[PDB]
Structures are given as C-alpha cells and as structure tokens.
C-alpha cells in the first residue's frame, strides 16, 4: 500500500544517473564514487533476492539508468567498478522471475539494442562478456526484436568483411548466434540459409580469423546438424577460402573440417569427399610439420575411417597414389 519502498528504489536509480566527477577535491570524488558503488551493490542484492519488487514504474527507471551509464563513447579503464555493477544489475533485472517483457518492450526498443551493439566494439573483454550475456537474454525474451537483432548483427558482419575488417566483438556475437541456430525451426527459413552462405562462410576470408574461429566453426557445424543439405556448399567454400599459402592458419581449417566430418551424413560425404581428400593429401605432404600432424590425426578419428573404408575405391588412390590406382 505505501510506495515508500518503491519510491526509494526510484530515488536510488535516479541517483546513479548523476555523472558528477567532483574533480578539484579528491576526497569528495572518492566519497561520491563510494556512495554510487554502494547504491548499486544495494540494488543488485535487492532485485536478486527480494520478491515482487520490480513493479511497473521501475522498468523505465532501470532502462534509463543503464542508458545514461553504459551508452557512451568508447575510449581508444578505471571506471570499470561502476560499469560492472550496472551490467550485473541490468542482468539481474532481465533474469528476474518477476520481469515482464510485455512492460519492458516499451523501453527495450530498437534504438536501445542498437546502442547496445555499438558497445560490442569495446576493447575490454570483460565488457564484451557482459554484453554477450545481456543481448542473449534480450533476444530470448523479446520476440519483437529478434528480426531486428539478426539484421543489425549482419550489418556489423558485412562491414567487417568488405570494409573496416576491424571489430573487437566478432567472437561474442558469433557465440550468441550459436544458441539461436541450435533452436532454429524444422524447415530452416531462407533468411537463415542466406546468412550461412553469404555471411558465415565469407567470414573465413578475413585475416583476423584466428580470433573468432572457434565460434565461427561452431555456427557452421550447428547449421549442418539442423539441415544436412547445406554440407556441400559449406565444404566447397572452406576449400575455396583454404589458405593456399602453407601457413599455421590452415591448422584451424583442419579443425573446422574434422568437426564437420563428425556430423556429416554418408550421402553428403560422397559428394565432396574427392575435393576434400585432395586438399587433405596436400596437408599430409606439407612442409609445415604442424599442419601435417593435424591432418594425420584424421586417421585416429573412428567415424572418419568408416567413411574411408566405405569409399576406399576413390579415397585411397588420392591419399596414397604410389600404392592404389583407380579406374572405371
């Protein structure tokens, strides 16, 4: 009945929107940073454990407090203790069982998720981890934003492939998409298939592939476990984007290629087995021992030897030409 408990919550949220920086007096600055850090810690534990505290007027105050503190200009950081508490408070706000997306959708709009994506270019890996979790939760709770979030993530990827070729959050964004792909509907819609062929595959061309390669490979494998039909244009694309210059970079392609073979269908294997083992034979005879060791590890794979024993008439003449011939 009395809004004293709700009014104090709104007071402390609005108090955290004061970007004061006292300067001049160092003691007053430390006192201000303390009371803001204390208020944030108080609200974090309050919203996590107390029940029925997220009332309807609380929603616009939380989103405003997050926007005033987080949506800033990225430096080219000593204020991280405050930033981390705001990420934690917002995450506990989204994860609360009392959180109602029907109310927060009025304030978690497209303009909000756009400014949230701009923060993924932060150089701080701790910040990108909080952004990764935050956007993953917004996607899963706001169906009216899922189409927009997928569209804007692609715009960041198209710019990263054909323009700037510089973005520090490529790995975190790909980690989010891996959970969306794992839940894709039965007949993969055309939007998702165009995303695989024209976004995920061209991501192997960028020079900085070594930074987001584990995440990129996971999205490619999950696409083939949903629809095995896409195995042929994926494998042929990796062979196209394969580093013709023998370098340690092609060890990453060998890992992605075995992870694909672990989920490939037999009927889909025979359609690309010849061009694949022709590249694989080039790796087992490569001057770089590190890439030959990784290729020779394919024989240790139990499932891969089964596909070779079933296609020995065509695969063996390619791997060991001095010992096996072929004909009609």
């Amino acid at each position: 009945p009395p809004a004293d408990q709700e009014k104090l919550f709104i007071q402390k949220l609005r108090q955290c929107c004061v970007l004061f920086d006292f300067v001049s007096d160092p003691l007053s600055d430390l006192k201000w940073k303390e009371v803001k850090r204390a208020a944030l810690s108080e609200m974090v534990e309050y919203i996590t454990h107390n029940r029925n505290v997220i009332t309807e007027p609380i929603y616009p105050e939380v989103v405003h407090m997050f926007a005033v503190n987080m949506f800033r200009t990225l430096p080219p950081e000593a204020a991280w203790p405050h930033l981390q508490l705001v990420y934690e408070f917002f995450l506990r706000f989204l994860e609360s069982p009392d959180f109602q997306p029907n109310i927060a959708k009025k304030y978690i709009d497209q303009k909000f998720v756009l400014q949230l994506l701009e923060l993924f270019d932060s150089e701080d890996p701790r910040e990108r981890d909080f952004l990764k979790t935050t956007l993953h939760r917004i996607y899963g709770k706001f169906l009216g934003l899922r189409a927009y979030i997928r569209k804007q993530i692609n715009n960041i990827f198209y710019r990263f492939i054909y323009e700037t070729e510089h973005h520090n959050g490529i790995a975190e964004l790909l980690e989010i998409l891996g959970s969306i792909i794992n839940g894709f509907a039965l007949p993969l819609k055309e939007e998702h298939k165009i995303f695989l062929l024209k976004v995920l595959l061209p991501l192997h061309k960028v020079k900085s592939l070594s930074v987001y390669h584990p995440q990129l490979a996971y999205c490619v494998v999950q696409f083939l476990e949903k629809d095995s039909t896409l195995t042929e244009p994926v494998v042929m694309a990796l062979l196209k984007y394969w580093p013709k210059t023998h370098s340690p970079k092609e060890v990453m392609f060998l890992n992605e290629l075995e992870e694909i073979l672990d989920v490939i269908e037999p009927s889909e294997f025979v359609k690309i087995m010849e061009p694949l083992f022709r590249q694989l034979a080039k790796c087992v005879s490569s001057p770089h021992f590190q890439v030959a060791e990784r290729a020779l590890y394919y024989w240790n794979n139990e499932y891969i030897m089964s596909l070779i024993s079933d296609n020995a008439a065509k695969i063996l003449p390619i791997m060991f030409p001095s010992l096996y011939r072929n004909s009609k």
């Binding site: 891996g178 959970s179 969306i180 839940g183």
Partner: peptide, 10 residues
C-alpha cells in the same frame, strides 16, 4: 557463460 539454446518457435 556457454549461453542456453534460444528456440526460434515454440
């Protein structure tokens, strides 16, 4: 943080 699966459609 491994991120749980997000179902496209129920």
């Amino acid at each position: 943080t491994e991120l749980s699966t997000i179902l496209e459609e129920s």
